[PDB]
Amino acid sequence: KGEELFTGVVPILVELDGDVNGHKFSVSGEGEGDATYGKLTLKFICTTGKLPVPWPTLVTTLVQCFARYPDHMKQHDFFKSAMPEGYVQERTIFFKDDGNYKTRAEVKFEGDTLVNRIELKGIDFKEDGNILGHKLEYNAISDNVYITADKQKNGIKANFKIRHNIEDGGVQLADHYQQNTPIGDGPVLLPDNHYLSTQSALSKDPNEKRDHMVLLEFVTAAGIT
């Protein structure tokens, strides 16, 4: 029944509060998603001024309920099955040879709007590392989110890697460990193993003077034939 909430375009709101090594910041986002095509269009603003970490490092934190699940995979979509009451999404993101983010978010409907409210804490970062030193390129990320059921917690876990390009030519690995659990008591779908193929394209609004990120993203479930 949660699936039917995603047959059309759904407005999205995102609100993040962050503290990375004592550098506090907030981000707001607006846009919409259409799970029929796995398509997200979102614009994010740093409401506190300058973002103290690179925008690309916040993409995965800033609504996998918008994934396109093929018809033959509908029984494996935990994310929509938890709606409208929602789910908790928690991650640890380890940046190789640098610090880590720990994130806790609640994703749920408020009326007709899908809302992602996030708290992010970052620790152990190097002040002249690739994150606090803003050495990461601003282009695109693309990878696969590998999902497995967590039957004991009535939810799912996921793991994946993001390889952020460094301006001087290298790569900054971000190892992601994820858990999702329903907020409500309604039955949810516990999926067989599969993944979300995700492509995020990052751009700028030429008329926007605030520190910001425009995102066009596609999310497609795969791995079951």
Side-chain angles (χ1 to χ4, degrees), residues 138-156:
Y138 186 88
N139 48 329
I141 60 170
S142 175
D143 223 295
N144 289 338
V145 175
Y146 295 99
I147 294 171
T148 188
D150 193 355
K151 289 103 165 177
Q152 47 186 223
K153 322 312 176 210
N154 193 38
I156 59 168

PDB file of all heavy atoms in Angstrom, residues 138-156:
ATOM      1  N   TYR A 138      33.934  18.628  -8.003  1.00  0.00           N
ATOM      2  CA  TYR A 138      32.478  18.774  -7.988  1.00  0.00           C
ATOM      3  C   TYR A 138      31.948  18.298  -9.342  1.00  0.00           C
ATOM      4  O   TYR A 138      31.882  19.063 -10.294  1.00  0.00           O
ATOM      5  CB  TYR A 138      32.167  20.243  -7.781  1.00  0.00           C
ATOM      6  CG  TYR A 138      30.701  20.579  -7.598  1.00  0.00           C
ATOM      7  CD1 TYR A 138      30.140  20.543  -6.338  1.00  0.00           C
ATOM      8  CD2 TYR A 138      29.898  20.944  -8.665  1.00  0.00           C
ATOM      9  CE1 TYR A 138      28.811  20.851  -6.137  1.00  0.00           C
ATOM     10  CE2 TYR A 138      28.551  21.270  -8.471  1.00  0.00           C
ATOM     11  CZ  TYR A 138      28.033  21.218  -7.200  1.00  0.00           C
ATOM     12  OH  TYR A 138      26.710  21.542  -6.975  1.00  0.00           O
ATOM     13  N   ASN A 139      31.568  17.027  -9.444  1.00  0.00           N
ATOM     14  CA  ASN A 139      31.101  16.560 -10.752  1.00  0.00           C
ATOM     15  C   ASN A 139      29.921  15.603 -10.672  1.00  0.00           C
ATOM     16  O   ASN A 139      28.784  15.948 -11.040  1.00  0.00           O
ATOM     17  CB  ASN A 139      32.255  15.927 -11.553  1.00  0.00           C
ATOM     18  CG  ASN A 139      33.072  14.909 -10.741  1.00  0.00           C
ATOM     19  OD1 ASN A 139      33.212  15.024  -9.530  1.00  0.00           O
ATOM     20  ND2 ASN A 139      33.629  13.919 -11.429  1.00  0.00           N
ATOM     21  N   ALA A 140      30.184  14.401 -10.183  1.00  0.00           N
ATOM     22  CA  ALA A 140      29.204  13.332 -10.263  1.00  0.00           C
ATOM     23  C   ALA A 140      29.685  12.173  -9.418  1.00  0.00           C
ATOM     24  O   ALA A 140      30.889  11.935  -9.294  1.00  0.00           O
ATOM     25  CB  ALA A 140      29.034  12.855 -11.705  1.00  0.00           C
ATOM     26  N   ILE A 141      28.731  11.437  -8.862  1.00  0.00           N
ATOM     27  CA  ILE A 141      29.044  10.183  -8.203  1.00  0.00           C
ATOM     28  C   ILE A 141      28.114   9.118  -8.750  1.00  0.00           C
ATOM     29  O   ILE A 141      26.967   9.392  -9.121  1.00  0.00           O
ATOM     30  CB  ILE A 141      29.004  10.245  -6.657  1.00  0.00           C
ATOM     31  CG1 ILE A 141      27.636  10.651  -6.124  1.00  0.00           C
ATOM     32  CG2 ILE A 141      30.076  11.213  -6.150  1.00  0.00           C
ATOM     33  CD1 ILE A 141      27.528  10.487  -4.595  1.00  0.00           C
ATOM     34  N   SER A 142      28.623   7.895  -8.818  1.00  0.00           N
ATOM     35  CA  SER A 142      27.863   6.792  -9.386  1.00  0.00           C
ATOM     36  C   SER A 142      28.377   5.525  -8.736  1.00  0.00           C
ATOM     37  O   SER A 142      29.581   5.267  -8.764  1.00  0.00           O
ATOM     38  CB  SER A 142      28.061   6.721 -10.892  1.00  0.00           C
ATOM     39  OG  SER A 142      27.419   5.576 -11.439  1.00  0.00           O
ATOM     40  N   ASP A 143      27.495   4.750  -8.140  1.00  0.00           N
ATOM     41  CA  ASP A 143      27.904   3.467  -7.588  1.00  0.00           C
ATOM     42  C   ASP A 143      26.655   2.656  -7.256  1.00  0.00           C
ATOM     43  O   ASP A 143      25.532   3.072  -7.547  1.00  0.00           O
ATOM     44  CB  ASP A 143      28.847   3.630  -6.400  1.00  0.00           C
ATOM     45  CG  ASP A 143      29.998   2.640  -6.457  1.00  0.00           C
ATOM     46  OD1 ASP A 143      29.711   1.433  -6.357  1.00  0.00           O
ATOM     47  OD2 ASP A 143      31.168   3.062  -6.630  1.00  0.00           O
ATOM     48  N   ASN A 144      26.867   1.498  -6.639  1.00  0.00           N
ATOM     49  CA  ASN A 144      25.818   0.534  -6.345  1.00  0.00           C
ATOM     50  C   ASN A 144      25.673   0.387  -4.841  1.00  0.00           C
ATOM     51  O   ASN A 144      26.657   0.141  -4.139  1.00  0.00           O
ATOM     52  CB  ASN A 144      26.172  -0.848  -6.897  1.00  0.00           C
ATOM     53  CG  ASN A 144      26.107  -0.925  -8.395  1.00  0.00           C
ATOM     54  OD1 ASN A 144      25.448  -0.138  -9.070  1.00  0.00           O
ATOM     55  ND2 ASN A 144      26.775  -1.944  -8.934  1.00  0.00           N
ATOM     56  N   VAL A 145      24.442   0.503  -4.362  1.00  0.00           N
ATOM     57  CA  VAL A 145      24.108   0.322  -2.951  1.00  0.00           C
ATOM     58  C   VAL A 145      23.671  -1.131  -2.758  1.00  0.00           C
ATOM     59  O   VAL A 145      22.580  -1.517  -3.199  1.00  0.00           O
ATOM     60  CB  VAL A 145      22.978   1.280  -2.563  1.00  0.00           C
ATOM     61  CG1 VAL A 145      22.505   1.052  -1.130  1.00  0.00           C
ATOM     62  CG2 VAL A 145      23.392   2.722  -2.801  1.00  0.00           C
ATOM     63  N   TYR A 146      24.479  -1.927  -2.053  1.00  0.00           N
ATOM     64  CA  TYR A 146      24.195  -3.357  -1.893  1.00  0.00           C
ATOM     65  C   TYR A 146      23.361  -3.574  -0.644  1.00  0.00           C
ATOM     66  O   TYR A 146      23.835  -3.334   0.464  1.00  0.00           O
ATOM     67  CB  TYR A 146      25.489  -4.176  -1.848  1.00  0.00           C
ATOM     68  CG  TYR A 146      26.220  -4.088  -3.164  1.00  0.00           C
ATOM     69  CD1 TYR A 146      27.273  -3.217  -3.346  1.00  0.00           C
ATOM     70  CD2 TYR A 146      25.806  -4.845  -4.246  1.00  0.00           C
ATOM     71  CE1 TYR A 146      27.926  -3.131  -4.584  1.00  0.00           C
ATOM     72  CE2 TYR A 146      26.446  -4.759  -5.467  1.00  0.00           C
ATOM     73  CZ  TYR A 146      27.496  -3.899  -5.632  1.00  0.00           C
ATOM     74  OH  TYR A 146      28.121  -3.831  -6.877  1.00  0.00           O
ATOM     75  N   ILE A 147      22.130  -4.046  -0.829  1.00  0.00           N
ATOM     76  CA  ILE A 147      21.138  -4.171   0.235  1.00  0.00           C
ATOM     77  C   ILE A 147      20.957  -5.631   0.620  1.00  0.00           C
ATOM     78  O   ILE A 147      20.840  -6.505  -0.252  1.00  0.00           O
ATOM     79  CB  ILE A 147      19.792  -3.596  -0.233  1.00  0.00           C
ATOM     80  CG1 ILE A 147      19.907  -2.088  -0.444  1.00  0.00           C
ATOM     81  CG2 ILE A 147      18.685  -3.915   0.754  1.00  0.00           C
ATOM     82  CD1 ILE A 147      18.680  -1.462  -1.117  1.00  0.00           C
ATOM     83  N   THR A 148      20.910  -5.890   1.928  1.00  0.00           N
ATOM     84  CA  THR A 148      20.540  -7.185   2.467  1.00  0.00           C
ATOM     85  C   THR A 148      19.509  -6.982   3.573  1.00  0.00           C
ATOM     86  O   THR A 148      19.460  -5.937   4.233  1.00  0.00           O
ATOM     87  CB  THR A 148      21.771  -7.906   3.015  1.00  0.00           C
ATOM     88  OG1 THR A 148      21.422  -9.249   3.372  1.00  0.00           O
ATOM     89  CG2 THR A 148      22.313  -7.194   4.204  1.00  0.00           C
ATOM     90  N   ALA A 149      18.660  -7.980   3.768  1.00  0.00           N
ATOM     91  CA  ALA A 149      17.688  -7.911   4.840  1.00  0.00           C
ATOM     92  C   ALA A 149      18.363  -8.058   6.195  1.00  0.00           C
ATOM     93  O   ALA A 149      19.358  -8.775   6.355  1.00  0.00           O
ATOM     94  CB  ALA A 149      16.662  -9.032   4.703  1.00  0.00           C
ATOM     95  N   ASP A 150      17.780  -7.395   7.186  1.00  0.00           N
ATOM     96  CA  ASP A 150      18.166  -7.525   8.589  1.00  0.00           C
ATOM     97  C   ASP A 150      16.905  -7.969   9.325  1.00  0.00           C
ATOM     98  O   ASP A 150      16.218  -7.160   9.952  1.00  0.00           O
ATOM     99  CB  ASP A 150      18.689  -6.217   9.112  1.00  0.00           C
ATOM    100  CG  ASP A 150      19.393  -6.361  10.437  1.00  0.00           C
ATOM    101  OD1 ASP A 150      19.385  -7.480  11.000  1.00  0.00           O
ATOM    102  OD2 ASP A 150      19.936  -5.341  10.920  1.00  0.00           O
ATOM    103  N   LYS A 151      16.596  -9.264   9.228  1.00  0.00           N
ATOM    104  CA  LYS A 151      15.315  -9.758   9.721  1.00  0.00           C
ATOM    105  C   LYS A 151      15.157  -9.540  11.217  1.00  0.00           C
ATOM    106  O   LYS A 151      14.042  -9.300  11.695  1.00  0.00           O
ATOM    107  CB  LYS A 151      15.166 -11.245   9.396  1.00  0.00           C
ATOM    108  CG  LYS A 151      14.941 -11.536   7.917  1.00  0.00           C
ATOM    109  CD  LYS A 151      16.200 -12.044   7.234  1.00  0.00           C
ATOM    110  CE  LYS A 151      15.875 -12.663   5.880  1.00  0.00           C
ATOM    111  NZ  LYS A 151      17.095 -13.113   5.152  1.00  0.00           N
ATOM    112  N   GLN A 152      16.249  -9.637  11.973  1.00  0.00           N
ATOM    113  CA  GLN A 152      16.169  -9.478  13.422  1.00  0.00           C
ATOM    114  C   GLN A 152      15.741  -8.070  13.820  1.00  0.00           C
ATOM    115  O   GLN A 152      15.078  -7.894  14.848  1.00  0.00           O
ATOM    116  CB  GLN A 152      17.512  -9.843  14.064  1.00  0.00           C
ATOM    117  CG  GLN A 152      18.739  -9.224  13.374  1.00  0.00           C
ATOM    118  CD  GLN A 152      20.064  -9.706  13.946  1.00  0.00           C
ATOM    119  OE1 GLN A 152      20.986  -8.915  14.148  1.00  0.00           O
ATOM    120  NE2 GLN A 152      20.172 -11.011  14.184  1.00  0.00           N
ATOM    121  N   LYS A 153      16.104  -7.059  13.032  1.00  0.00           N
ATOM    122  CA  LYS A 153      15.715  -5.682  13.308  1.00  0.00           C
ATOM    123  C   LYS A 153      14.539  -5.231  12.455  1.00  0.00           C
ATOM    124  O   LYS A 153      14.206  -4.042  12.453  1.00  0.00           O
ATOM    125  CB  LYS A 153      16.892  -4.728  13.094  1.00  0.00           C
ATOM    126  CG  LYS A 153      18.256  -5.263  13.531  1.00  0.00           C
ATOM    127  CD  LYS A 153      18.266  -5.873  14.924  1.00  0.00           C
ATOM    128  CE  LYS A 153      19.639  -6.461  15.249  1.00  0.00           C
ATOM    129  NZ  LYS A 153      19.552  -7.623  16.180  1.00  0.00           N
ATOM    130  N   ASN A 154      13.921  -6.142  11.711  1.00  0.00           N
ATOM    131  CA  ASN A 154      12.772  -5.810  10.891  1.00  0.00           C
ATOM    132  C   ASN A 154      13.108  -4.717   9.878  1.00  0.00           C
ATOM    133  O   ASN A 154      12.289  -3.846   9.588  1.00  0.00           O
ATOM    134  CB  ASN A 154      11.594  -5.394  11.775  1.00  0.00           C
ATOM    135  CG  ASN A 154      10.285  -5.343  11.032  1.00  0.00           C
ATOM    136  OD1 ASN A 154      10.001  -6.179  10.174  1.00  0.00           O
ATOM    137  ND2 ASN A 154       9.456  -4.368  11.387  1.00  0.00           N
ATOM    138  N   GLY A 155      14.311  -4.759   9.330  1.00  0.00           N
ATOM    139  CA  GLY A 155      14.737  -3.746   8.378  1.00  0.00           C
ATOM    140  C   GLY A 155      15.775  -4.262   7.414  1.00  0.00           C
ATOM    141  O   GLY A 155      15.786  -5.441   7.045  1.00  0.00           O
ATOM    142  N   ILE A 156      16.660  -3.364   6.995  1.00  0.00           N
ATOM    143  CA  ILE A 156      17.670  -3.680   5.998  1.00  0.00           C
ATOM    144  C   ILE A 156      18.995  -3.085   6.437  1.00  0.00           C
ATOM    145  O   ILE A 156      19.055  -2.179   7.267  1.00  0.00           O
ATOM    146  CB  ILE A 156      17.334  -3.176   4.565  1.00  0.00           C
ATOM    147  CG1 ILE A 156      17.154  -1.648   4.547  1.00  0.00           C
ATOM    148  CG2 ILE A 156      16.100  -3.869   4.017  1.00  0.00           C
ATOM    149  CD1 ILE A 156      17.118  -1.042   3.175  1.00  0.00           C
TER     150      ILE A 156
END
